[PDB]
Structure 1
Amino acid sequence: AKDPRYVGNLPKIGIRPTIDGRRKGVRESLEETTMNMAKAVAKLLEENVFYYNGQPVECVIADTCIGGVKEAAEAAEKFAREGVGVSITVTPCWCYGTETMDMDPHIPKAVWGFNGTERPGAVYLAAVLAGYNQKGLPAFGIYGKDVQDAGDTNIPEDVKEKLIRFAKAGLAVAMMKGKSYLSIGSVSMGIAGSVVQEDFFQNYLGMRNEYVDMSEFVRRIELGIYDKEEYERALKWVKENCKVGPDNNRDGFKRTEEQKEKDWEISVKMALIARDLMVGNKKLEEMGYGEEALGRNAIVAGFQGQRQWTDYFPNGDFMETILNSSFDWNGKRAPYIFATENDNLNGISMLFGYLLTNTAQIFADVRTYWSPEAVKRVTGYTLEGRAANGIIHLINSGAAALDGTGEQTKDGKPVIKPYYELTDEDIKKCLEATQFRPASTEYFRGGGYSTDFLTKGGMPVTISRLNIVKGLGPVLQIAEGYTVDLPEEVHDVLDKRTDPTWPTTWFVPNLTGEGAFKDVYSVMNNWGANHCSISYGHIGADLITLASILRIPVNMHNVPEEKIFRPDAWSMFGTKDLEGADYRACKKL
């Protein structure tokens, strides 16, 4: 399938049915069973793994079973030709190890050996993984716990989980390759993550780095380099759906009605320009701006904002809010992963979660750790339930996807769904639960409008953050948990003394009684940056798998050990201490 926004086609998953090369007996009796195994995996993935636009992932099966090097070479040729970015080998029998291996070092690979008794399927699995390990080609091994009868096309649950987790992580990794990260502006207020380390994007993600100074926005706004028809429709939509809340700026800091109107006009134009910069806009060609029409083929971008742009122009709050949302004046659509303060590392953190779930990701500051003692002292209230051990205030400096309201609903529960699953009611509720507030001029002299909402409680979420550490390189931290509801009177008190015009999410991480998850305080004290990315759901296991494919160690996470799924080679670096083994494996391989 053609990628609707980026150059080229969406990555495909290649299935390699390997078989015993011996004919006049063995192979003939296994041809149908082996190919059927491949077809079963394709059906499973097509019904459980989807591209960001909602289309089912597409699989490519080798033209023949692979019993030797000649057939392996033909599969490699076919896969390269059809744009395969992930590979899965399947077999119910013994096959000739290295003669049948996928030697492409540039694609995530897994092997599923049928747990059957008649043929050495598990023997091939272990044998070929030993080859992958010996050759330095990481590969995931999948082996079911319960013996299945020959030809059983029904894939067991434990196998299903591994196949899907691998496919999703592999697809996410394949999706980033060849795409750009667009830096709009430069470093923002000395934030480490706003410094672009090209080596990381190039070598770890296979991405390109594009740059554009914010002065570009001045030129396009002044010269009208954007779709004026869309602009008028957008401005109208904002007036009809974006509710303006109370101005918290006190006299001397309040902007005029005229200024506030212009703040909206420019904020909308900024959204259009940012999007045009990321994916281009064919409308610009008929307008005489052919170069601008191309776009930077960016699957993720960031906007510096402070301090240079915001000291004079409206801030990027609305732009950052709307782009990351799953809908706007043009209807429901896939989010545009856009980072506040040009924090590219948080941008990538958001991108990981997005490519694994197809859901909008929430940019946020890890603002405050509220202990039970502190809440009691300030509000007279005793935290209860999940919040009984303390809570963490997640609140970005003014921008957040409207999806963050938690108003989207499934089975009567708060969630964030892929845009293609949104109902008209989901969207209306997200908007109705949001208030746009005039920007605090003491911080943002140029004005603008911040996003004000309160995430509904009881929603499972995962916060994550990618950091780059000297002497180590990229490193990922994860914290699964839930959002929580505080009594209205309690929230109001904690909210007013912090930043009531910004978006609030009350988070409680799952505790393990070990590592950095002994208590809620430890989770925040161990976070490695001020920012984090929030995704709906518990995707820590998916993130761990994705990280291992990228060779990025996970310094901190609260995912149950039984759910850790990494390439077979990782076990060779240690089975008692998976953390240490992860570091050793990431460096050596």
Structure 2
Amino acid sequence: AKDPRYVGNLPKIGIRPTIDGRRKGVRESLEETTMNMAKAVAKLLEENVFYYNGQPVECVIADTCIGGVKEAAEAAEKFAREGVGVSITVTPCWCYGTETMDMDPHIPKAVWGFNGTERPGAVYLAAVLAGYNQKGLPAFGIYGKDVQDAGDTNIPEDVKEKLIRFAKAGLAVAMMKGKSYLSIGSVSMGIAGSVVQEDFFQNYLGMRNEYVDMSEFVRRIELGIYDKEEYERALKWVKENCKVGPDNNRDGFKRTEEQKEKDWEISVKMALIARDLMVGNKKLEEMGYGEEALGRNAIVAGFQGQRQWTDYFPNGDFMETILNSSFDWNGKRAPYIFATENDNLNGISMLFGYLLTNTAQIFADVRTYWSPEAVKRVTGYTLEGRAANGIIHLINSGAAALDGTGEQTKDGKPVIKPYYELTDEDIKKCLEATQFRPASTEYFRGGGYSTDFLTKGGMPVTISRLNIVKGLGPVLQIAEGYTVDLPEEVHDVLDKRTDPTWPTTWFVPNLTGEGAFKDVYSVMNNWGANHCSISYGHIGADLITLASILRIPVNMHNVPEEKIFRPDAWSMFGTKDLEGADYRACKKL
């Protein structure tokens, strides 16, 4: 399938049916069963893994079973021509290891060996994995716990989970290759994550780095380099659906009625310009701006904003809010991963979660750790339930996807859904639960509008953050948990003394009693940056698998160890201490 926004086609998954090369009876008796395995996996993935636009992932099966190097080469050739970016080998029998291996170092790969007795399928799995480990080509091993009878095409639940987790992680990795990260502006207020380290994007993600000074926005606004007809529709949509909340600026800092109207007009134009920069716009070509019409083929981007832009122009809160949302004046759509303060590392943190879920991601500041003692002192209220041991205030500096309201619903529960599953009611409620507040001029002299909402509680979420550390390189931290509800009056008190015009999410991380998860305080004390990305659901296991494919160690996570799924080679670096083995594997491999 053609990628609807970026150059090229969406990555496909190649299935390699390996077989015993011996004829005279052996191979002849196994071709049908082997191909059936390949077809079963293709069916499973097509029903469980989808591209960001909702289309089911597409699979490519080798033209013949693979019993030797000639057929292995043929599969490699077909996969290269078909645009395969992930490979899965399947077999119910013994096959000749190195002769049948996928030797492409640039493709995530897994091997599923049927747990049958008639033929040495597990023997092949273990044999070929030894080969992948010996040759330095990381590969995932999938072995079902229960013996299945010959010919059984039903895929066991444990096998299904691994195939799907591998496929999603593999697809996410394949998705980033060749795409750009667009840096709009430069470093924002000395934030480390806004410094662009090209080596990371190039060598770990296979991405390109593009740059554009914020003065580009001045030019496009002044010369009207954007779809004027869309602009008018957008402004109208905003006036009808975006409710303006109270102005907290005290008289001396309040902007005039005229300024506030201009703040909206420019805020909308900023949204159009940012999107046009990321994916281009044919309309610009028709207007006589052919170069600008091309776009920067960016699957993720960031906007510096403070201090230079915001000291004079409306801030990027609205732009950053709307782009990351799953809808706007043009209807429901996939989000455009966009980082506040040009924090490219948070942008990538968001991108990882997005590519694994197809859901909008929430950019946030790890603002305050509220202990039970502190909440009791300040409000007189004793935290209860999930919040009993403390909570963490997640709140970005004025911008957050409207999906963050938690108003979208599934089975009577709060969630964030892929845009293609949204109902008109879901969207309507997200908007109703949001208030747009005139920006605090003491911080944002140029005005603008911040996003004010409160995430509904009880929603499972995962916060994560990618950091780059000297002497180590990229490193990922993860914290699965839940959003919580506080009594209205309690929230109001904690909220008012912090930043009531910004978006709030009350978070409680799952505790393990060990490491950085002994208590809630420790989770925040061990967070390596001032920002994090929030995704709906518990995607820690998926992030761990994705990280291992990228050779990015995970310094902190609260995912049950039984759910850790990494390439087989990792176990060769240690089975007692998985964390240490992870660092050793990422460094050597």
Match for residue 281 of structure 1? Answer: 281
Superposition deviation, residue 111 in structure 1? 0.1
Superposition deviation, residue 315 in structure 1? 0.1
- Matching of residues 345-424 of structure 1 within 5 Å: 345-424=345-424
Q: Deviations over 1:451-507 (max 9, x none)?
A: 000000000000000000000000000000000000000000000000000000000
TM-score, normalising length: structure 1: 1.00
Superposition deviation, residue 527 in structure 1? 0.1
SS in structure 1 opposite 2:538? coil
Superposition deviation, residue 285 in structure 1? 0.7
- Matching of residues 176-575 of structure 1 within 5 Å: 176-575=176-575
Q: Could you tell me how far apart the structure 2 residues matched to 1:555 and 1:184 are?
A: 30
TM-score, normalising length: structure 2: 1.00
SS in structure 2 opposite 1:21? coil
Q: Deviations over 1:103-156 (max 9, x none)?
A: 000000000000000000000000000000000000000000000011111100
SS in structure 2 opposite 1:104? coil
Q: Could you tell me how far apart the structure 2 residues matched to 1:568 and 1:177 are?
A: 24
SS in structure 2 opposite 1:476? strand
Q: Could you tell me how far apart the structure 2 residues matched to 1:411 and 1:116 are?
A: 39
SS in structure 1 opposite 2:42? helix
Q: Could you tell me how far apart the structure 2 residues matched to 1:155 and 1:254 are?
A: 64
Superposition deviation, residue 448 in structure 1? 0.1
Q: Could you tell me how far apart the structure 1 residues matched to 2:252 and 2:184 are?
A: 31
- Matching of residues 98-177 of structure 1 within 5 Å: 98-177=98-177
SS in structure 2 opposite 1:169? helix
Q: Deviations over 1:293-327 (max 9, x none)?
A: 00000000000000000000000000000000000
Q: Deviations over 1:7-42 (max 9, x none)?
A: 000000000000000002100100000000000000
Q: Could you tell me how far apart the structure 2 residues matched to 1:531 and 1:151 are?
A: 51
Q: Could you tell me how far apart the structure 2 residues matched to 1:417 and 1:151 are?
A: 38
SS in structure 1 opposite 2:336? coil
SS in structure 1 opposite 2:253? coil
Q: Deviations over 1:38-63 (max 9, x none)?
A: 00000000000000000000000000
Identity %: 100
Q: Could you tell me how far apart the structure 1 residues matched to 2:301 and 2:442 are?
A: 27
Q: Could you tell me how far apart the structure 1 residues matched to 2:433 and 2:555 are?
A: 36
Superposition deviation, residue 249 in structure 1? 0.3
Aligned-residue CA RMSD in angstroms?
Answer: 0.2
SS in structure 1 opposite 2:9? coil
Q: Could you tell me how far apart the structure 2 residues matched to 1:13 and 1:536 are?
A: 26
Q: Could you tell me how far apart the structure 1 residues matched to 2:227 and 2:444 are?
A: 27
SS in structure 1 opposite 2:345? helix
Q: Could you tell me how far apart the structure 1 residues matched to 2:110 and 2:103 are?
A: 12
SS in structure 2 opposite 1:516? helix
Q: Could you tell me how far apart the structure 2 residues matched to 1:457 and 1:85 are?
A: 38
Superposition deviation, residue 272 in structure 1? 0.0
Aligned length: 589
Q: Could you tell me how far apart the structure 2 residues matched to 1:153 and 1:424 are?
A: 40
Q: Deviations over 1:356-412 (max 9, x none)?
A: 000000000000000000000000000000000000000000000000000000000
Q: Could you tell me how far apart the structure 2 residues matched to 1:492 and 1:568 are?
A: 50
Q: Could you tell me how far apart the structure 1 residues matched to 2:24 and 2:264 are?
A: 76
Q: Deviations over 1:197-227 (max 9, x none)?
A: 0000000000000000000000000000000
Q: Deviations over 1:180-205 (max 9, x none)?
A: 00000000000000000000000000
Superposition deviation, residue 582 in structure 1? 0.1
SS in structure 1 opposite 2:533? strand
SS in structure 2 opposite 1:501? coil
Give unmatched runs, 5+ long, in structure 2: none
SS in structure 1 opposite 2:251? coil
Q: Could you tell me how far apart the structure 2 residues matched to 1:229 and 1:251 are?
A: 36
SS in structure 2 opposite 1:72? helix
Q: Could you tell me how far apart the structure 1 residues matched to 2:262 and 2:5 are?
A: 31
